[PDB]
């Protein structure tokens, strides 16, 4: 899953 600040 993408990191919290990735999107």
């Amino acid at each position, epitope marked *: *899953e*993408l*990191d*919290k*600040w*990735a999107s």
Partner: antibody, heavy 132, light 108 residues
Framework: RITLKESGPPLVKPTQTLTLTCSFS??????????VGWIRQPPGKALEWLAI???????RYSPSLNTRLTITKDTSKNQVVLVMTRVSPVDTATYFC????????????????????????WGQGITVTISS | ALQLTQSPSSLSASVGDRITITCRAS??????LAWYRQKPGSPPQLLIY???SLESGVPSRFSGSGSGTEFTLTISTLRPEDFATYYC?????????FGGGTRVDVRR
């Protein structure tokens, strides 16, 4: 100005529940985007990521340990707790809690995310042994 | 999970020397990569964040670069306190993961 300190039992028996507490100062877990994570280091091995919890109560766990880990925060007491159930000697290691910066803000407005890409401050760590 | 491979696993060097450690990810992690230094009996310490940014208080001899799947950490002039183990960490994907570490010892 940021300090983290881990506390818990130095020895636990297999099948028991391990409870670790991270007490910190220098920052609030109520600050935008800030996070606190746990990382372990088994004897003579590499670092292993366990979980992280953020100011907005969002939280994530290492998938392989998902069912045994639970992380919670207490903003009022400046503490983060990690609970691990059904421990085994495989869990023997030094456990560290660490701070993760939230995005940089200008007058309260998020401007850059770069500083979140790291765990900038780590506690001294606590060594926990699981054995009967 | 995302695999991080550090190389070399072990490195021999002398004070004053220039060394470079590489980290390779199984897939792109953009610039979400950090480097830490760890001395025996102590916790990891942040050197570089976001692939190339120098953490405040860290000596200018440390530098980092790269993006995507290839990153490097460099110490221009090695110091006595630099003989330790170094680790990379990616924070682009959950779970965050660390490389296997790189130990730097005294050459002879």
């Amino acid at each position: 100005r940021i300090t983290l300190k881990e506390s818990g039992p130095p020895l636990v028996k297999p099948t028991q529940t391990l409870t670790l507490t991270c007490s910190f100062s220098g920052f609030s877990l109520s600050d935008f985007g800030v996070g606190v994570g746990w990382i372990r280091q088994p004897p003579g091995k590499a670092l292993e990521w366990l979980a992280i919890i953020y100011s907005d109560d969002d939280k994530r766990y290492s998938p392989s340990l998902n069912t045994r880990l639970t992380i919670t925060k207490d903003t009022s007491k400046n503490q983060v707790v990690l609970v691990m159930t059904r421990v085994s000697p495989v869990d023997t290691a030094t456990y560290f809690c660490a701070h993760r910066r939230g995005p940089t803000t200008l007058f309260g407005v998020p401007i850059a995310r770069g500083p979140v890409n790291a765990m900038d401050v780590w506690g001294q760590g606590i060594t926990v042994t699981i054995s009967s | 999970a995302l695999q991080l491979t550090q190389s070399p696993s072990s490195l021999s060097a002398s004070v004053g020397d220039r060394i470079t450690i590489t980290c390779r990810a199984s897939q792109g992690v953009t610039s979400a990569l950090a480097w830490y230094r760890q001395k025996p009996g102590s916790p990891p310490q942040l050197l570089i964040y976001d692939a190339s940014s120098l953490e405040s208080g860290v000596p200018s001899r440390f530098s980092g670069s790269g993006s995507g799947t290839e990153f490097t950490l460099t110490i221009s002039t090695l110091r006595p306190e630099d003989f330790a183990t170094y680790y990379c960490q990616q924070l682009h994907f959950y779970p965050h993961t660390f490389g296997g570490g790189t130990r730097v010892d005294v050459r002879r």
